[PDB]
Design a protein around this motif. Structure first.
Motif, PDB file in Angstrom:
ATOM      1  N   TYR A 141      67.790  23.534  -3.848  1.00 21.42           N
ATOM      2  CA  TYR A 141      66.580  23.000  -3.214  1.00 21.42           C
ATOM      3  C   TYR A 141      65.552  24.112  -2.964  1.00 21.42           C
ATOM      4  N   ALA A 142      65.156  24.812  -4.031  1.00 21.35           N
ATOM      5  CA  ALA A 142      64.313  26.008  -3.999  1.00 21.35           C
ATOM      6  C   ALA A 142      62.875  25.764  -3.505  1.00 21.35           C
ATOM      7  N   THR A 143      62.425  24.513  -3.434  1.00 20.60           N
ATOM      8  CA  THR A 143      61.112  24.125  -2.909  1.00 20.60           C
ATOM      9  C   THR A 143      61.201  22.835  -2.096  1.00 20.60           C
ATOM     10  N   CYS A 144      60.231  22.628  -1.214  1.00 27.99           N
ATOM     11  CA  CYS A 144      60.002  21.387  -0.496  1.00 27.99           C
ATOM     12  C   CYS A 144      58.579  20.896  -0.750  1.00 27.99           C
ATOM     13  N   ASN A 145      58.438  19.654  -1.206  1.00 22.61           N
ATOM     14  CA  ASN A 145      57.159  18.983  -1.451  1.00 22.61           C
ATOM     15  C   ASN A 145      56.942  17.748  -0.553  1.00 22.61           C
ATOM     16  N   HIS A 146      57.759  17.571   0.493  1.00 17.51           N
ATOM     17  CA  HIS A 146      57.673  16.441   1.423  1.00 17.51           C
ATOM     18  C   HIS A 146      56.316  16.386   2.114  1.00 17.51           C
ATOM     19  N   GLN A 147      55.864  15.178   2.429  1.00 16.81           N
ATOM     20  CA  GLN A 147      54.684  14.900   3.241  1.00 16.81           C
ATOM     21  C   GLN A 147      55.051  14.442   4.657  1.00 16.81           C
ATOM     22  N   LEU A 148      56.270  13.935   4.869  1.00 16.40           N
ATOM     23  CA  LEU A 148      56.866  13.696   6.184  1.00 16.40           C
ATOM     24  C   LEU A 148      57.756  14.865   6.649  1.00 16.40           C
ATOM     25  N   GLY A 149      57.940  15.025   7.961  1.00 16.82           N
ATOM     26  CA  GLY A 149      58.690  16.154   8.527  1.00 16.82           C
ATOM     27  C   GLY A 149      58.008  17.515   8.341  1.00 16.82           C
ATOM     28  N   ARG A 150      56.684  17.530   8.171  1.00 20.80           N
ATOM     29  CA  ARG A 150      55.866  18.720   7.956  1.00 20.80           C
ATOM     30  C   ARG A 150      55.017  18.977   9.189  1.00 20.80           C
ATOM     31  N   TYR A 151      55.255  20.106   9.820  1.00 20.49           N
ATOM     32  CA  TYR A 151      54.601  20.510  11.051  1.00 20.49           C
ATOM     33  C   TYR A 151      54.251  21.987  10.935  1.00 20.49           C
ATOM     34  N   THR A 152      53.259  22.457  11.665  1.00 17.48           N
ATOM     35  CA  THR A 152      52.938  23.882  11.753  1.00 17.48           C
ATOM     36  C   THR A 152      52.571  24.211  13.183  1.00 17.48           C
ATOM     37  N   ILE A 153      52.770  25.459  13.591  1.00 17.04           N
ATOM     38  CA  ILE A 153      52.351  25.947  14.909  1.00 17.04           C
ATOM     39  C   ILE A 153      50.839  25.786  15.094  1.00 17.04           C
ATOM     40  N   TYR A 154      50.063  26.096  14.057  1.00 13.01           N
ATOM     41  CA  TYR A 154      48.609  26.161  14.143  1.00 13.01           C
ATOM     42  C   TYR A 154      47.955  24.779  14.202  1.00 13.01           C
ATOM     43  N   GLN A 155      48.341  23.887  13.289  1.00 13.51           N
ATOM     44  CA  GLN A 155      47.634  22.633  13.016  1.00 13.51           C
ATOM     45  C   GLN A 155      48.351  21.389  13.576  1.00 13.51           C
ATOM     46  N   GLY A 156      49.570  21.531  14.099  1.00 12.85           N
ATOM     47  CA  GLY A 156      50.419  20.400  14.475  1.00 12.85           C
ATOM     48  C   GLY A 156      51.043  19.718  13.257  1.00 12.85           C
TER      49      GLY A 156
END
Lengths: 515, 515, 509, 133
Positions: free
Chosen positions: B241-256
């Motif tokens: 699983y060398a990459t992740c392209n998900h649009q769900l479960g995606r969060y960042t410190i900066y942008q939420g």
């Protein structure tokens, strides 16, 4: 100690500023402190508002009610409270300025008393005269500086020691010509020049932060823990909902999730039952089943009788002839469940008070073909028959000696603010459209664990709509509930505003913004 | 500046302690500071470890790689970082002690350089000699105090100013007889005696706290944002699983929340579509429908093309003959939906690359009786046919100019740590048992917004099992992913341990505990 | 080379009703610190706590002994660091002083926020550290919260050329301001700085997992990385735990009330419920099994291959009738909550079990496919009772087991019950831990024991944990290393849990 | 008591010579001795090997084993042992030089302890720190 007088602008009265030491301060030698840590000289020069240091005297308030009760500690001042996280211990008193918005055409008196540690506060202004105290008059009071000792029998404090208190109450009732007149009282603090900290330690503490920072997420971004697949769409108020007996959506600052509540209500909504021998008398379709307990395998009376997070919606006393809960149900096989469809279900046996309308392991499902000792999926999804918001609002009873959440009520004159979601019908078993309320969402109180509440104090929250053209105010209690002040069936507040921390207040505090 | 020498225990070499000022400090007069705030004298006497002030030199590391790169600021020292929250501004340099675990039977050299603000760091030890710098030898180095100036053109700093840096790299490669030998380097800091703060302000800042306090909730208490009705049951690692392209479960410190992610994944899982004219060529059962967009009514190319939080599970390129997604579907009526049951569905038209395997508004449902322009409930619930974990793992492609989450990868030698849940089958449409992975849960990064991350730094987390008889270590990145160091198909970590903040590290840091 | 990371504040002792001076010579000789011995290796991870000590009279051999007759005390210690270093090693320790009420951090980063000294392996030897007595009170009483010394790996141990280990010992003397406060009888709760062990050989001790058979061997096996046993579990803190007992022989015999019905598809395998004299109300919080009753494993869902074996016979006025051998097992042969579960429901392979009749149960063997391996894994814990926790030796160590041979019972009758010979291991014997209750173990400390063979000519070293197990340091791997049971244990010293025994057992001879 | 350091030939380490009195000597007045008999001054200047005063530390040897155990008596020195045959009684201590063939590229430590009469020797280096050592 001293007093000075100033004439008012118009010369129609006077204001007094008084400085007093009711009890002598005993400056510690700090001979046992390994190091003595000085504060920045400007921290002694800054008077900040005290957490819970705000009360309003109406002509209604009795000379028996305590208006303010405050521990003499680093938590009195914003910068000493922040600084104390960095230190093992502390010593020294506080200057406490009582700012009174008085007037020359009023009448009445305050009493302020210093109370030693391990002494109880009396509910009487007559008994407060036995302590070191001051009396203020509402005609002339403006500022009173109390030089409050740090009363101790030890060289310096560590955390968890019992502390001296300031107490303020009415000595003689407020009178005015106007029925609307109030005396507003505010308390500010700075450390006295003899105040010190004792040892630098990494700034990680159980002690609550002086300011709470709240995420700014709207209620609609937060899970409804009593209906997890449905979003919150309104905050809601209903003056008939005088108590909450829910076991889901129950959280506290101290203990975390309480009753049968969880921080993943969406992953806990699903359960499984094993289908029993027999059926409810007179209803052969109503097959008994027992909810499976992974957390309670041996069925210990002290651990919960229902799986963590499983549905606590009501259906009334002895009412299966009238209404039911609805679920998806399906038999267990390899890898999952087979023939999953909608069935009616309920708690108990529709007759006995120990079982019927009770949050406990025994249910019935209205499916005539349950195989004995086979396992069935249970996903609660709606209600049927005469069911409505008020039936769903009252949970099944708690019972026995397990650690259930207690029944809670708002203080007199206040009302609960609910997180509300619309739960849709589903049709050919047929469900009915109903609204589900939660007392709190786990996504709000998540933030409050990361900051803490000062012991004995409540968060006054602003709730900000349209960037600020409307602001509601709520009290969020550490006991888990959120509450509003109301005058004058259901009332609706939009769910797309955001919470903002205003201040710490006492449970007794009257919210000035009225819904 | 000075140097002192100590003989080693056995007399088989020497250690050196050196104090140096590579560049003169320019002590500010602070004439424009409204107040000058002194620190507690003991804060100048305490050397704490610096955030990201830890690196290991192996004989593999090149004299081109930057080992440490640190801004000269209040964030260097634990107590100045905590104290700075209370202040508007600051002035003055830092003592920076470089502690080198050297040995007399090694060889090689460090270079440490001071770099002025608004100058770039070169990837070359040859170019670092152009700056004010020091050189250390691994045979004799023990302690080096750098007196690091606060390089400024202003009387004192406010927040958001650009700062001077310390940079450390290898000057001459590490050599030893042993292949296993490493030089461990650690950087500690205290403020210089000329360090001051400038103005007391309430302790509320955007600036990250020096210590992160994590709730101690286990992964199993946290929602899986890619499968919200199912609990997390393992943390998981898979080297393919060398990459992740998900649009769900995606969060960042900066942008939420980023991509199409949400903080209420359980309340966002449900969607609705309007049923279109026509069907997929060769499959008349596969009726088209358009997902309804409440957030995107006018179908703006810059706003998301799919409803907030709706399923991003994969099914492969041109594979409807082989496999599908499964949902509950039912037609819209008064109060809810009618005849709700399991149907196969998928994104696109099973042929065109702009639609097939693409996260966009157009779907098909395998139900032959969709009424034109009627609305249908869509609750994704499983997968069918040849579907498996690896097909579900690769999301449909992002497309166009909307603000999607980017494809992310672990640094070379590291692997992603996944939140994993078992999703059960359901049987007569028939689903297959599958495991769903999320890159992150919103319940972990909730805590990280309430503390912040220092800019350019990553959280090293301990993950604590059985009270501490096993401890894993992970890097949690501010970009949302969590990662482990691995040597040597799937690997399983229990979900009933808890996260504990260890320290701040650089993205380049090699985790010492290996899975 | 004298470091005070935090100042020592001298108490006046004004408030003390008496001030008791020590012998002037106790301030002048540095002794080893009772538990202040630890090892660092190249395997030892960064941020690991190597040593934790309460700053108290227990830091010195003489003041730990003297404190047994005092109610209270004041003053710090002067510690010296004895480092058995070498020419090739690099690395750093951090020594931190934690104030009384503060929690110990789990990382080097947070630990550097305390008053500390960093100690490089090239120069740490003979360094002196003041351990100050931090308090806000005139002197301590017993049971007060105390400041800690914490030693942690700051930079890991690395070597040029050869892969050495470093053993560090602390020595201590009280500072001149150290005093005691009030004479009390010499019975007080602090652990003695020396434990004296009576020289009883292992063969003279009971095996609590097979009471009738003598211990014949101390035993080591690299695959026995876990103990889940309920029998043979004793701790210095709690005594016997998880259904263990101090008389394992007397507790070995149960009775069971026979239960209506039989195992599904196996009508000869009649159920019974064990009778519970100590739990007659059948509380889930009390044990589900009679105390001291057999916890032998017999595989998972394994009844077709293997069973436990016991003598049984029905109760009468005259004791028990027609006593002879049967096969038995815990729970069902199928349900995960019953099968291979230490709980009340058993089955006996006896068609003759009468409903509501009570039967003797004396476990004495295993049958069919049962081996040492299957007996070694006990039936699972289940429910909310105070069961003994599953334990492992730390990384790089093995348990030392008390082992006894259990002989095979044979019968010549067709269909007669037949046992297979097996060895039974116990984690501890109550007869060794007997003297540890009177002495005490120091807080968070392990006993290093010499085990003495051949009149002193061979000396094994074992670590006895207060949680109720012995471990050895070992090299290679083996599924049958034997140590003779005719030696005796001699107390060597107290050590930190993470100390690595120098004396390594060559486990492949 | 004192210590002196010498650099090794190659400068790859050091050797130490240490003189120590772990416990104070109490010089007897000899007031009850009928005569006091002096030794030849050269007997105080001759260090002989002690009977049983030889042991080899391998990396196998445990910190529990006693390497040397010697009574402080005229039998320690060759000429005092021979001379004592001629005498009814004796008084006074001994200089005991422990000669260690060490090296700078080894590691490890000895403990040497003085043990009073009518006290037992412990089989533990931890317990030897309770004596003058």
């Amino acid at each position: 100690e001293n007093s000075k007088t100033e004439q008012v602008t118009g010369a129609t009265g006077i204001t007094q500023s008084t400085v007093t030491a009711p009890l002598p301060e005993a400056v510690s030698s700090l001979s046992l402190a390994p190091t003595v840590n000085a504060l920045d000289p400007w921290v002694y020069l800054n008077q900040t508002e005290v957490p819970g240091g705000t009360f309003t005297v109406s002509s209604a308030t009795q000379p028996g009610s305590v208006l303010l009760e405050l521990e003499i500690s680093p938590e009195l001042n914003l910068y000493t409270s922040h600084l104390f996280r960095m230190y093992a211990g502390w010593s020294g008193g506080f200057s406490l300025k009582l700012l009174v918005a008085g007037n020359a055409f009023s009448a009445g008196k305050l009493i302020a008393a210093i109370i030693p540690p391990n002494i109880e506060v009396p509910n009487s202004a007559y008994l407060l005269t036995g302590f070191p105290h001051e009396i203020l008059d509402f005609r002339t009071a403006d500022s009173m500086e109390i030089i409050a000792p740090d009363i101790k029998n030890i060289d310096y404090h560590f955390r968890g020691d019992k502390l001296g208190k300031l107490v303020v109450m009415v000595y003689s009732p407020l009178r005015s010509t106007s029925a609307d007149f109030e005396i507003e009282i505010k308390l500010t603090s700075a450390p006295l020049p003899d105040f010190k900290f004792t040892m630098l330690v990494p700034p990680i503490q159980n002690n609550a932060l002086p300011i709470w920072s709240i995420p700014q997420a709207p209620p609609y971004s937060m899970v409804n823990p009593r209906s997890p697949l449905t979003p919150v769409v309104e905050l809601y108020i209903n003056s008939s909902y005088a108590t909450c007996n829910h076991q889901l959506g129950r959280y506290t600052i101290y203990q975390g999730a309480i009753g049968n509540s969880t921080f993943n209500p969406s992953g806990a909504w699903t359960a499984t039952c094993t289908a029993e021998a027999g059926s409810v008398t007179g209803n052969p379709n109503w097959r008994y089943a027992l909810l499976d307990l992974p957390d309670n395998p041996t069925f210990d009376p002290t651990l919960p009788p229902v799986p963590r997070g499983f549905c606590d919606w009501g259906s009334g006393v002895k009412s299966g002839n009238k209404q039911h809960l609805v679920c998806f149900t399906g038999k267990k096989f390899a890898g999952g469940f087979q023939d999953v469809d909608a069935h009616m279900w309920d708690y108990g046996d529709n007759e006995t008070v120990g079982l019927d309308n009770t949050y406990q392991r025994t249910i019935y499902i209205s499916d005539p073909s349950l195989e004995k000792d086979a396992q069935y999926l249970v996903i609660p999804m709606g209600v049927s028959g005469a069911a409505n918001d008020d039936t769903v609002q009252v949970a099944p009873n708690c019972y026995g000696s397990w650690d259930y959440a207690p029944t809670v009520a708002p203080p007199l004159g206040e009302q609960f603010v609910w997180f509300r979601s619309q739960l849709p019908a589903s049709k050919t078993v047929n469900s009915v459209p109903v609204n589900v309320n939660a007392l709190m969402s786990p996504d709000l109180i998540r933030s409050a664990y990361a900051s803490g509440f000062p012991l004995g104090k409540v968060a006054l929250l602003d709730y900000v709509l349209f960037g600020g053209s409307v602001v509601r105010q709520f009290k969020l209690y550490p006991e888990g509930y959120m509450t509003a002040n109301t005058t004058g069936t259901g009332f609706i507040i939009p769910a797309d505003g955001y919470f903002r921390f205003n201040s710490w207040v006492s449970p007794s505090f009257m919210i000035s913004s009225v819904v």
